[PDB]
Amino acid sequence: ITDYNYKKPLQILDKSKIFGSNSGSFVMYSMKKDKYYIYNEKESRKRYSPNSTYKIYLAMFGLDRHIINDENSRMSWNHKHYPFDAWNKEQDLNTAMQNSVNWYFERISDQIPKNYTATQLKQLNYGNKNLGSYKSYWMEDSLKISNLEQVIVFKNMMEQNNHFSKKAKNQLSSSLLIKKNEKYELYGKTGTGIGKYNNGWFVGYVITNHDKYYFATHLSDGKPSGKNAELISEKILKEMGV
Numbered sequence: 001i002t003d004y005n006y007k008k009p010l011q012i013l014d015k016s017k018i019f020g021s022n023s024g025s026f027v028m029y030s031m032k033k034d035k036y037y038i039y040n041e042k043e044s045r046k047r048y049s050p051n052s053t054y055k056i057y058l059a060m061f062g063l064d065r066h067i068i069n070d071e072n073s074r075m076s077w078n079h080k081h082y083p084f085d086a087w088n089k090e091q092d093l094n095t096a097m098q099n100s101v102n103w104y105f106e107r108i109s110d111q112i113p114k115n116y117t118a119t120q121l122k123q124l125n126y127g128n129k130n131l132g133s134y135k136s137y138w139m140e141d142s143l144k145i146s147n148l149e150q151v152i153v154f155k156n157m158m159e160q161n162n163h164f165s166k167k168a169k170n171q172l173s174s175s176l177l178i179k180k181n182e183k184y185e186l187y188g189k190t191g192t193g194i195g196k197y198n199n200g201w202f203v204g205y206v207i208t209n210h211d212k213y214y215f216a217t218h219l220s221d222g223k224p225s226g227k228n229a230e231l232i233s234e235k236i237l238k239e240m241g242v
């Protein structure tokens, strides 16, 4: 009822054929040129739950409040059998991000009061800002963000001379690196919502030798999967600027 699509106004694109039988949007931002590039402006402004992309923010708050740190991003397994075998071991930040280990981020969340989080979501302009009963509010629930916001918000949280330390930003960055060769480094995080897949995400950024870009892809129908959002994301960055 209070849910609304992203209002704040700020070049656009046609990637309709890469998306094919999936539907959703793409957003990109050039540091050097200070401009946005968007495929599907209207869909890009619709608010969806960020699901596992919110781990970015959970990690950042975890490092800020010290809940986890340089040396002790650790946290033990509760010896509960989850389907993913990568989830069934000791974790650190890199491991839990790479492998999107829900229990690790949920334990960070456990230790964070609604008022630090609400304050943070307000400084950051994180969508909705709608926390719930404040449980797993990021996992298909009250909290919601648009694809466009994902990009502005992430770019602003990392680039603004702001209260998060360069060091926690850098540990986060490490946790999110996905590909690297000579030309580029690609960073980001997959999100997959569910008995059905209906909300797929891939949010991140790429550093080349020349420029630095933040981008995000959402998926709502077709095969809205974190996996497919990453593929689409990769085909767009390739077919555009190496």
Ligand SMILES: *C(=O)[C@@H](NC(=O)Cc1ccccc1)[C@@H]1N[C@@H](C(=O)O)C(C)(C)S1
Binding pocket: 051, 052, 053, 100, 102, 139, 140, 190, 191, 192, 193, 194, 225, 226, 227
């Ligand atoms: C984050 O998106 C996680 N998704 C789920 O656990 C599914 C789910 C269940 C209940 C509520 C909301 C979402 C992990 N992220 C993805 C991903 O990285 O694409 C996985 C499917 C790997 S699990």
